[PDB]
Structures are given as C-alpha cells and as structure tokens.
From TrEMBL, chain A:
It comes from Adeno-associated virus 9. This is Capsid protein VP1. It is found in: Virion. Belongs to the parvoviridae capsid protein family. It comes from the Viruses.
Length: 105, 105
C-alpha cells in the first residue's frame, strides 16, 4: 500500500505520453546529413476526459450516537470554501481526509 | 393463542430499502383502570373553577388510547440524522399496529 496513501496495483493505469511531431522549417537546397536541428515552434491544445468508475461499500452500522460527518462551517466569511476568489484563483483551504464514519473493531 | 406461547415477536429494526424507510418500534405498555370504570364528566366547575377563557365541559372516559404521533417514537436519533442529512422530504405511506402479548394482573 503506497505509503503516501492510495491503492497498490501491480498493473496501474498506463502513462499516456503525448508529443507533437517535429516539422522541419526549410532544409537546404544542398544535401546535409545532420539531424536538421531547425524546427518551427508550435504547440497543441484540446481536451482530456478521464471517466473512472468507483465501487462503494455502503455502511450499515447499528450505532445510535449520531455519526461524525464532514461539514462546511456556517459562518460569514469573505469567500466560500472551495470557491473562486475575487481574482478567479480557486482556493482549497484544508485537506479533506476520508476517515469520518466509525466502525467498531 | 394459549397461555404458554408468545403471541408475537419483538420487532424494533429500522430497514432502509432505498426510497422507503420502514421504521418499526415496540415498547411495553402498562394500563391501569381509569375512573374506576365510570364515565365521570369534567368541567371547571368540578376542577375548582377557571377563568372565562379556560372553561370547558367534557367527559372522562375510562379508556386508554395508544398515541404515537411524535417523530421520536419511530426514528432513533441516528435514523433521524440519516433522514435530515441527505433527503429532500418524506411522508408516511402505511401503518401496522400489532398489539400483542397481553397479560392481565
């Protein structure tokens, strides 16, 4: 189990390496055997979509004391948590764990 | 049926099928004999008087009536948490009132 947390897989999802092909600018009229180091500058754009279906294990604890949950505090503040600032920068205030429910040993 | 045979088992679970929440409940009841099996009438004239606003005239029937129109009769506070936290409304759909296991003393 990777010590930073997560899932340990012998065959994780593969890398997706993307490269935009070189297109040489204008090679000489006379032959030359070198690597043709003069390429025209360019880049790319698009979209990338990652649909990754999870499987859940619902909880059925017979606990009577109300569970402890994760909530966002109701109190007036300059910015909503997990919402963009006046300039447009998306700010995440705190790390969110995944251990909130309680299950007896 | 018969003295030595329980006439019904104690159901108290609270199933959560999904879009249906069957909330059984069971408590032990003790019922005395009210009013010595009579129908004495009640008025503020008998209860020592009252203001003009509080005058009333009614009968004190000797019957006891089972009342369960309070939400905490059925919903354990954990169920009430699971029903307010993530739900946009609810309404009763059916009822089932088993009165079993009488013993007169």
């Amino acid at each position: 189990s990777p010590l930073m947390g997560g899932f340990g897989m012998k065959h994780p999802p593969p890398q997706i390496l993307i490269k935009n092909t070189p297109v040489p600018a204008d090679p000489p009229t006379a032959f030359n055997k070198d690597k043709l180091n003069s390429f025209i500058t360019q880049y790319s754009t698009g979209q990338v979509s990652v649909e990754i279906e999870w499987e859940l294990q619902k909880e059925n604890s017979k606990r009577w004391n109300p569970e402890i949950q994760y909530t966002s505090n109701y109190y007036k503040s300059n910015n909503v948590e997990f919402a963009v600032n006046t300039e447009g920068v998306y700010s995440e205030p705190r790390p969110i764990g995944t251990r909130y429910l309680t299950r007896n040993l | 049926d018969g003295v030595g045979s329980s006439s019904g088992n104690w159901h108290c679970d609270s199933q959560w099928l999904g879009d249906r929440v069957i909330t059984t409940s069971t408590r032990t009841w003790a019922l005395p004999t009210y009013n010595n099996h009579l129908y004495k009438q009640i008025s503020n004239s008998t209860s020592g008087g009252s203001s003009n606003d509080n005058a009333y005239f009614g009968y004190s029937t000797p019957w006891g009536y089972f009342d369960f129109n309070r939400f905490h009769c059925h919903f354990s506070p954990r169920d009430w948490q699971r029903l307010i936290n993530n739900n946009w409304g609810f309404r009763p759909k059916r009822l089932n009132f088993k009165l079993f296991n009488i013993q007169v003393k």
